Symmetry: C5
Subunit: 311 residues, 5 copies
């Protein structure tokens, strides 16, 4: 079997559509997501045309092997899609209507800069390669692009599923390629990060600041060092859920900054003890009283600056 | 091969049934479960009708390729089911009896609000897409819906496996779709959560309250900070067994609330020490004595309020 | 191809045998194990009978497609077995000898009540479904049931591999089903649990009891709280190797009980300090001296009671 | 297709060879390793004899389905090998030369007694079952046994890859079996265990011994209990990399013994404090001074004894 | 089908090219990476030559089964590549142009000596085994070697993808083998290691040095032992992301060295306390004051020495 011949010297237009049935397994570390969807294809093959009267049929059904079908592939997939043909219908003018249901693991880069208050644009790139006989170009049938109402992505909110209607036509290995961009816009469900990571992390930090109302060096060392260790645990927990980035994430910036607060609190606790041993407590008292205001104030201003730089 | 023709203009009814053989791997984080079952299908094909007197045979056995079989699919599966045809039997009137044994990974959302005292309704959605020649509709043969007595789902109690007899008939990509809802009702085995998470978490909290019978600041700081760290460990352990939710779970609410109790206990321990250093121990004594009653009382009332809001 | 016709009115007897080549991956949490074995099948098909003199052969070798073969399945498997036919041999009287080598992941429930001193009976259920033409029944050829001497299951001792010779015949969807039970008896290698979990857990508990020979409240708080935290670590380690059970395991019972010992030790340490602060040390001394005997004695008696209830 | 006929009453000899291309994934806990290799087979089939004059060609190339090929299997594999035929060459006398490239996961037991200074002999067992028409026997073509120079097994040193030339011929399920033993000798790269586990474990133990130069009970309790907790962490880390064994490993013996040293150090610290409180410090001083020598000396002698028993 | 015959006695040249579409899953512990690419092949088959004026067609499209195709394999792959033929084009002179899209898991050793500031050269080895009729040699078509602009490897920077144009021709099991080396040069994104591992590790070490400004033994023991435990946690975290190496890594060297600093700090804290108890504080003061300078100075010089030895 060979591609449909051109009346005149035009490319063969293959109309496409993707209808999402299921969206699952968004892996942050791997920067992948799994998809289960319908892929619809449509093109004109004059060689398959028929007269309805003498045939007695308004439509003709074919097996994929019986007719010419364009070799449509996904660019950003781990392995080739698992596909099963649902229907192949031919109308009198030879207009072919192809429908398959597929499942695929899609590679799509993620921007973690605003994590866990981040939004992403996931991409599904559809592609066709031209043949020596003729050039094959892709188009979007907007009536056949969509998603099931029940489509849910655990830990995320699904905003939209749209297609960039104009294909990216270019040369690859001395043959022309026609590429379409299907976009799935999602926003992260940040809720759980507040009672599980953010507030526990703030509680332990505020607990370390009780050392500014204590003259007991031994108790102060215990307060600041113990809470620091708990902060290390939260830092480790956060970085296990994320890939390594050449940039700072919003959460990563806060976590890093809190180390500086623990480090300066240790210096204060040391300075206070040293002065008291040196029989200079009036002075140590001035530093401790200033610290009671300075630590929460600098923490608030530094957080306003960070939120501003990131959002 | 083509679908059976209508005698007058009626849709083709495909009678269905699912008989569960095995239920395994309920993954909370992934919101999936694996199933091994029998799928039974039945429809009338007059083209296959025969005379039992002349044929001498009461039933005819066919290979799937020899006859027309409806394209039945599962909506909420990761990948297409792994199926093997067991039997195809045709009665003299042309009624076809199809039986296959399949295994599938099913995606079904879970409500964690009442965790670990939660119940779930797992769904298996059966679907058929209508052909151009005629509309295909699904039905439930209640005599072919069930489960093996030995069916067990580790960590859960299986209540029932029933089917919603009325299909959801709708248009999808300019064709009719007939959808059936098979429901597997389960309730979580909460037992082990009591000696492993709930009681150890309560023991460490009550240990922190022994600081209300101690005047030693250094020992009090050690009591409240050490038990807080153990509470952080249990919080981390709990959230690893669960996906991220846009709501609070029952356990998550208790765990979060216990942080406030540790935070206020640190304030009390700090206030007590501060007053004693300021030569005001009579006053510190009043706060400490009140705390001995206030902390268990407020803990009990807050838990009654939470249990009421969640159940 | 169709089943062998009955001479009279008798069911077709299919003689079976399983010879274990490899046993691996016993997953406690999943309640599964992997198996690699030979499956042997034998039945009488008179249509295949031949005269040795006329044919010039004493045995006839066929391909699976050439002859009728019973559809034998495993009940308790995750997915269908990976099988490869080794040989098919027909004797002059039509006695067929079938041999296949297979691999399968088997679901078999485990009783963790006596963990890690538990024994299990793993099951491999062989099944056949009867055809409209005739009833198929399974039998055990004891001469073809066994295991390779080198068969080892890491962390376990293999006791026996036997078959329950009488099948469980029952109706499923108006057809006779014949089920055979192949049993693999195993006992857990508890050795490593002694130096890795049991003795370290006892050492830290005995270390907490040194507080009964100390008047230092601050050192006592450090002794009991630090060892409790180490006990939490061991509790977490143990529950990660096990699924959630609606019952207490032997190890789980000991682990739970040890929390009560830590809790009462904290009360003793608190009571002792309180009395000494109240200028009542003679009294605190009586409680501390009694605790030195009471704690090891109650620990020994409670363990005797537990061992008795579990074994 | 059937096996080659015997001239006179001899078994069919199938010459074998395995050439290792890649060795990877040695899983200690699973006791498996993955292999990618060439499997070469050679046998005489006179029914394939040809005249180069008549056929034109000096060597005939066949497809596996066109000719009789011996059913060669691996004994100790999880699933059947992933194989791809590279060549099937038939010479004029009927000598067949078969070459396939395969990949397989091999189950081979490991002896952890000397871990991490252990060596292993991994096995790949080749097998053939005899047919009714004639007995099949395996042989080793030493010219076709080997490994690529670049073959590396991460964390191990590869010593040799040889074959036991004499097959193990035996009866199994009333037929002959011919088994060959291919051996891959490896030795563990112990280097990294020294700076990562052994020396950090020794440092924390020696830190606990500083308590023998301190009279401060509260500081001593902190020294011995904190380092013990760090030792528990290392014990847990080590046992996660290893399966459960019915014997003690070398590392496991040292780790277990170090607990006794921590336990006796706690007793010493308790005894010292008790005597000082009882106004007997001269006596406490004698025990502490003896401990300074006894602890490192007994540690050295116990380690010499252990190294001797294990190596 | 058989290979193309030689005009004179020249080997058959198969021109190759690899065009990377996707690069993902660089596993450090496994020393593997996944690839999705185009594999292009080109050779001359005179038996396929045709007249362009007579045939009408300028290029002829064949199915893989219709023509002879060289058996091209990858040396360093876990399992055989997942390949799908895109196009086969024959020019009038008989020049065949083969194109397939494949996905493969590649084994390629990694040098961790400079981790996390390391660079790697990943290899993809293409190979062909000669046939009895003629020798097959591989060549690089540089015009068909490349990578998509969007190719990204999470946690790494992709530098170049080039091929060593000269094949490695050698004898293996009495037949010629032609091997090509495709090289993917990458450099690690070290950024995240600085705020997540390096700086937190330095902060805790500097916190341990505050003990040189404290006379309180009990507080000093708490400072040095607590920070040491946090250092153990970071050592464990680092070694989980890496395989076991027969050499020291840069990070591993620093981590190991920091243990010596903690060990000597404990000695200093012990010596200081011992002298003060012995009524020699003027001397303890000299050692403590020297330590304030010695510890940061020796730390800086040791790090300069290490950086010099590794880079
Ligand atoms: C201590 C610091 C605590 C973190 C504060 C939240 C950061 C923030 O302000 O996050 C902001 C994000 C939303 O950002 P967005 O709408 O997606 O940005 C897009 C809009 N632009 C382009 C104009 C920037 O979340 C929220 O509004 C929820 C706030 C939750 C607060 C929980 C605090 C405890
Ligand atoms: C401190 C707080 C401890 C937690 C208390 C259990 C919460 C609860 O009361 O849980 C209640 C659940 C059952 O709820 P259900 O039947 O599934 O709800 C459905 C019914 N409705 C719709 C009317 C609400 O478990 C139990 O009855 C078991 C109680 C175990 C107590 C263990 C305590 C230690
Ligand atoms: C503190 C508590 C320590 C645990 C004590 C072991 C429990 C026990 O006694 O375990 C008993 C089990 C064996 O039980 P079985 O033969 O499989 O039961 C079947 C027989 N029936 C039906 C009659 C009950 O192990 C042993 O004999 C090994 C004992 C190891 C002791 C290690 C102690 C440290
Ligand atoms: C504290 C205890 C530290 C552990 C000491 C190493 C045990 C040992 O001596 O290990 C010995 C093994 C080698 O044993 P092999 O050659 O494989 O035995 C086969 C020979 N036979 C059969 C005669 C027994 O490693 C070495 O030579 C390396 C020594 C590294 C020392 C690191 C110490 C820090
Ligand atoms: C305390 C020690 C902190 C670690 C210091 C970095 C080591 C280093 O100097 O790393 C050097 C590497 C680059 O090395 P390269 O270009 O790949 O080597 C190839 C060149 N040769 C062959 C000539 C050697 O990173 C950098 O330049 C980034 C420096 C980051 C510093 C973060 C410090 C906090
Ligand atoms: Cl694809
Ligand atoms: Cl399906
Ligand atoms: Cl099966
Ligand atoms: Cl019955
Ligand atoms: Cl029946
Ligand atoms: Cl095999
Ligand atoms: Cl390959
Ligand atoms: Na086609
Ligand atoms: Na302390
Ligand atoms: Na069909
Ligand atoms: Na058959
Ligand atoms: Na064959
Ligand atoms: Na070919």
């Amino acid at each position: 079997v060979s591609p449909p011949p051109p009346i005149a010297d035009e490319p063969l237009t293959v109309n496409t559509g993707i209808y999402l049935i299921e969206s699952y397994s968004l892996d942050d570390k791997a920067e992948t997501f799994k998809v289960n969807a319908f892929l619809s294809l449509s093109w004109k093959d004059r060689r398959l045309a028929f007269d309805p009267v003498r045939s007695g049929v308004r439509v003709k059904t074919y097996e994929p092997e019986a007719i010419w079908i364009p070799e449509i592939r996904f660019v950003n997939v781990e392995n080739a899609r698992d596909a099963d043909v649902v229907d192949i219908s031919v109308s009198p003018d030879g207009t072919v209507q192809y429908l398959e249901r597929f499942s695929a693991r899609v590679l799509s880069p993620l921007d973690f800069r605003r994590y866990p208050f981040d939004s992403q644009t996931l991409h599904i790139y559809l592609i066709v390669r031209s043949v020596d006989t003729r050039n094959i170009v892709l188009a979007v049938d907007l009536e056949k692009v969509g998603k099931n109402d029940d489509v849910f992505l655990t830990g995320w909110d699904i905003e939209s599923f749209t297609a960039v209607v104009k294909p990216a036509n270019f040369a690859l290995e001395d043959r022309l390629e026609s590429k379409l961009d299907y976009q799935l816009r999602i926003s992260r469900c940040y809720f759980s990060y507040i009672p599980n990571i953010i507030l526990p992390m703030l509680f332990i930090l505020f607990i370390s600041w009780t050392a500014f109302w204590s003259t007991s060096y031994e108790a102060n060392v215990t307060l600041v060092v113990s809470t620091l260790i708990a902060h290390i645990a939260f830092n480790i927990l956060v970085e296990t859920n994320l890939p390594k980035t050449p940039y700072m994430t919003y959460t990563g910036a806060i976590i890093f900054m809190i180390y500086l607060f623990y480090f300066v609190a240790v210096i204060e606790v040391t300075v206070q003890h040293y002065l008291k041993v040196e029989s200079q407590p009036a002075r140590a008292a001035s530093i401790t009283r200033a610290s009671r205001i300075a630590f929460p104030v600098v923490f608030l201003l530094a957080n306003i600056i960070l939120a501003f730089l990131f959002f």
